[PDB]
Amino acid sequence: RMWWAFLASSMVTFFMTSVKDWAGVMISAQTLTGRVLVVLVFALSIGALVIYFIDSSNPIESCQNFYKDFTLQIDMAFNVFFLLYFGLRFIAANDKLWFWLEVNSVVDFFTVPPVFVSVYLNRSWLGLRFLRALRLIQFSEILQFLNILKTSNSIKLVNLLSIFISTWLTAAGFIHLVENSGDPWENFQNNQALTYWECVYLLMVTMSTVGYGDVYAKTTLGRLFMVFFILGGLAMFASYVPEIIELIGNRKKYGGSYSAVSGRKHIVVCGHITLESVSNFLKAFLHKARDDVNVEIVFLHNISPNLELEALFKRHFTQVEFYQGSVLNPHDLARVKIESADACLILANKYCADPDAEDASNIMRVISIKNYHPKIRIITQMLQYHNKAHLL
Amino acid sequence: VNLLSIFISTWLTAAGFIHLVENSGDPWENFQNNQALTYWECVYLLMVTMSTVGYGDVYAKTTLGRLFMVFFILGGLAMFASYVPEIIELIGNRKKYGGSYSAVSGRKHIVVCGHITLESVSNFLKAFLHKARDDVNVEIVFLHNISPNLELEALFKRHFTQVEFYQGSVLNPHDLARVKIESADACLILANKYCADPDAEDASNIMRVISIKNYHPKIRIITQMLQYHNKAHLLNIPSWNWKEGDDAICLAELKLGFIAQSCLAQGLSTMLANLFSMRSFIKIEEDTWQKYYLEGVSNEMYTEYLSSAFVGLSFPTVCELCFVKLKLLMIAIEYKSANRESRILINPGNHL
Amino acid sequence: HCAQPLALRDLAVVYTLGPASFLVSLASCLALG
Secondary structure (H helix, E strand, O other): OHHHHHHHHHHEEEOOHHHHHHHHHHHHHOOOOHHHHHHHHHHHHHHHHHHHHHHHHOOOOEOOOOOHHHHHHHHHHHHHHHHHHHHHHHHHOOOOOHHOHHHHHHHHHHHHHHHHOOOOOOOOOOHHHHHHHHHHOOHHHHHEEEEOOHHHHHHHHHEEEEEEHHHHHHHHHHHHHHHOOHHHHHOOOOOOOOOHHHHHHHHHHHHOOOOOOOOOOOOOOHHHHHHHHHHHHHHHHHHHHHHHHHHHOOOOOOOOOOOOOOOOOOEEEEEEHHHHHHHHHHHHHHHOOOOOOOOOOEHHHHHHOOHHHHHHHHHHHOOOOEEEEEEEHHHHHOOHHHOOOOEEEEEEEOOOHHHHHHHHHHHHHHHHHHHHHHEEEEEEEEOOOHHHHHHO | HHHHHHHHHHHHHHHHHHHHHHOOHHHHHHHOOOOOOOOHHHHHHHHHOOOOOOOOOOOOOOHHHHHHHHHHHHHHHHHHOOOHHHHHHHHOOOOOOOOOOOOOOOEEEEEEEEOHHHHHHHHHHHOOOOOOOOOOOOOEEEEEEEOOOHHHHHHHOOOOEEEEEEOOOOOOOHHHHHOOHHHOOOOEOOOOOOOOOOOHHHHHHHHHHHHHHHOOOOOEEEEOOOOOOHHHHHHOOOOOOOOOOOOEHHHHHHHHHHHHHHHOOOOHHHHHHHHHHHHHHHHHOOOOOOHHHHHHHOOOOOOOOOOHOOOOOOOOHHHHHHHHHHHOOHHHHHHHOOOOOOOOEOOOOOOO | OOOOOOOHHHHHHHHHHHHHHHHHHHHHHHHHO
């Protein structure tokens, strides 16, 4: 039992202008060298995580040497490359206290010395090597350099998922390490043999607050850190995610495109779409005495309807559809499939301040609809008689 | 701190209650039904209870113990629904667009302020960020005091990799310091074209120019002007240097001059618009007017210094050689003088 | 199996091996630049 040495190695390890400019240039993601270096170090972090996953089933303390097993040598090479990368990082920046406490720097400080001692010395120990899982936070970033991700929302979602998975795996490794070993004051005889995947399942049960209880931490250190993990999880859920989750939950209601059905014609109604005008138009058009029932009315107004107009649409949902858009925009005309529409009906604002302005607006709507599709019937309402001449 | 303190206080007090009740037994049960429970294990039980996990490894077995936990559950739900939630929502409030633009070396940025709405930003981004532009490293940072709405938010989002927004006014020097305007390449000021009174908006833009110049005199400012006669005020600023690069885009004079010169020769507005604006490449194979129109659009209007070989040659001869031998069309010449400032000459004659 | 659990010869260097490697890498980066 020599875990003290492998812990103290990392603990002790943790505790010109021209070359600084050169290092800043090389580390910078703006150049291709830095991009490729970050890609390589992320791939190596994934490899180290896979190595930890395999070694989880192995006994925590066992004597081995480099020539005995290859995977030990691959892990050693990964650690050497991480050491070179960390040296470049630390020498890159002007200030050094940030790199004295940087998250990636501290992860390297805690993961390199244990391997560096375990490669040649006996009693190979699966120490704090699960911290390599934290390198998945940078995952979203690499998708930016590889041009696969092109949307801010998608990048943010990938970053959120990566941070969630990184925290999950890091805490799972912590619980595995604390449970497989015992309480140091209890002479390590109170330990509980827990599979790493069982620890992941336990953490998933606890985060969701299901609490099945089939598996739980029994050591004092494990329970103390479980209490710390639920504290942190509740705090993060109340602080980190909720605003972003509400952002993801935001959605437009009436945006969309009309899904046409063959054999069922539709008429597109635009203009002054308001509760009174729509009410009158529906009580006349959709009167129960019409044998012509297959026609479907698609409304197109750029104002989002209020609750009363929403209810009016709800009552006749089987015949009435609504979309938010203006016939002036050709895209909104394309959405409602007006090229295949039987007819277009324009409602007029009868109670308008200036009748001539409203008539001009309706005429220009007619012009837009005709320009998109000349061979469509149009029935437009005219406030003033002398404004009809413009249609000629 | 008060919230955390009261949380810890009630947590430890209820844990002490459970420990006291469970270590002893029920008074009517002769205390022989007790459960041995360390105090820290009681704290752990309380925390796995309040988080509603409920492992079941540790639980109260006494009648009074299970009675208290029912009460501790009801009381905790009451405090979580009445006492804390308003303060919790208070802390969760955050200003979205507050912050400072963190400059990146080698990535020049321009600061855009003034009339920042959907239409102006839409037009300016459509024309500025045309895909043909090879000059891409320039980053646009917007500064307007009014928080953007949802659709302008989406417009900024679609160009998230090259467009940033920050809430503030250029009149306030702190907001100028937030966007790092001292290191900015240039500042553009957009004008409310459709305003009730152009004079007030022009005066507001002129104060914006004054504030930006006062913060840092050595900055280029491109400002839109609604009315021609308001440009004179820009001459009042000692820091306003036309030779340095400061320009006033007077919309009225430019639009009406385009229209008048079109009246003199129809299509000159299209001429100049296709000259200075930038377009994507479209190939037409079929013999239509559009093909020839594309080879017409292909040209762009440039400036460059003439070599010493043309010194001592008249403008018509220089234009002749440039067109015949170099396939370059001499349009204008910048004349240099000491008594007068540099002037543009349009088709100089033989004498010059 | 199980050659030796303790070694003072290697214990005199196990404490400094981590900082030794880190400082060597730092000095190599400084010199090569």
